[PDB]
Write a protein that binds this DNA or RNA. Structure first.
Lengths: 123, 113
DNA sequence: AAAAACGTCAACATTTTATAAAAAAGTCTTGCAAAAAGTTA
DNA sequence: TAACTTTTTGCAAGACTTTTTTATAAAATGTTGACGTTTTT
C-alpha cells in the first residue's frame, strides 16, 4: 500500500505508529504522527481547561485528551490497539475511563511497525 | 437544626431530599430542592452540549451533569447518599463514572427522609 | 537486440494545514428591585 | 406572626473572552509523463 508520497490509507499497514505502552495508534502519514507526538502534551493542557469550565471531577482526563487529539489529527481514519489486540473507538474509550482514576499519565512515543505476527495476532 | 424560616445549615439532618433511587441529594432549603428538580433535565442538555464541544464520546454524562448541577444549586453544602450509605464527593463521582456506560438516565424526584 | 515493463523524479494539479482577522457565542461584572432568610419584641 | 433588616436572587446593560467562521497563502499529497533501466523474447 502506501501511495507514491508516503500515505497509508489503510492504517493497519502503516509504518507510522505511536504507543503509550498501553495503547497504540496507527497513522496514515509521518506528518500526522509528528503532529500527534509533537503537540499532544499541549493539547492536554488546553483540554483540561475546557473541561474544567464544564465540570470539576476527581479524574485525570489525559488519555481522553489523547483519543480526542488522535481523532482530530488522523483525517484518514482510526485504527488502534489495546495491549496488542485490535481496539475499537468505544474500546479505547473504555480504557480511558478505567484509566482516568489514575493520577499520572503515560507519555507517548513512536515505535517501530508491529510485524506480521503481532499483526495477525491483533486481527 | 431547622432555622425559623426552615433552613438546614446541616444538610445531614434536612428534610429537603431529592433522589434518583441510586443516590440521594440533601438540600438545605426547599427552594434549592426545587431549583434542582425543576432545572436539571435542562442542565443535562446544556451540559452535554458543552461537553460535546470538548470531546465526543460514547458516554451518557447526565449523572455527571446531575452532580455538577447539585453542586451549583445547593449553596450551603454538599451531602449525599449512595444506595443507602453516606457518600463522599469522590464516591458519588465514581458512581457517575459507571452509569456513563448506560444508555438511559434515572430521573429525580423529591422524597422524605 | 529491441519492445514492453518498471521505477525515478521533475513539473503542474488538487487537497490540506496554518493562521490572521472578523463575527458571534458565551462569560463575568455592576446595579438595583424583588424574593428569601434572619431578627426582633 | 408581624414588622423590619439583611441577604440572596433575578435580570439587564456593558465590557470582555473564548469559540466559530472566513479567507488566503503555504505546505502536502496527488498525477502525469519523459527518461533511463530492466526483463522478456
Amino acid at each position: 500500500p502506501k501511495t507514491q508520497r508516503g500515505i497509508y490509507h489503510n492504517l493497519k499497514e502503516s509504518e507510522y505508529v505511536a504507543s503509550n505502552t498501553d495503547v497504540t495508534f496507527f497513522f496514515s502519514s509521518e506528518l500526522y504522527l509528528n503532529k500527534f507526538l509533537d503537540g499532544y502534551q499541549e493539547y492536554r493542557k488546553k483540554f483540561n481547561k475546557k473541561i474544567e469550565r464544564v465540570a470539576v471531577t476527581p479524574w485525570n482526563m489525559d488519555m481522553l485528551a489523547d483519543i480526542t487529539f488522535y481523532s482530530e489529527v488522523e483525517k484518514r481514519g482510526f485504527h488502534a490497539w489495546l495491549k496488542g489486540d485490535n481496539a475499537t473507538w468505544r474500546e479505547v474509550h473504555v480504557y480511558a475511563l478505567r484509566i482516568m482514576t489514575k493520577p499520572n499519565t503515560l507519555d507517548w512515543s513512536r515505535i517501530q511497525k508491529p510485524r506480521l505476527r503481532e499483526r495477525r495476532k491483533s486481527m
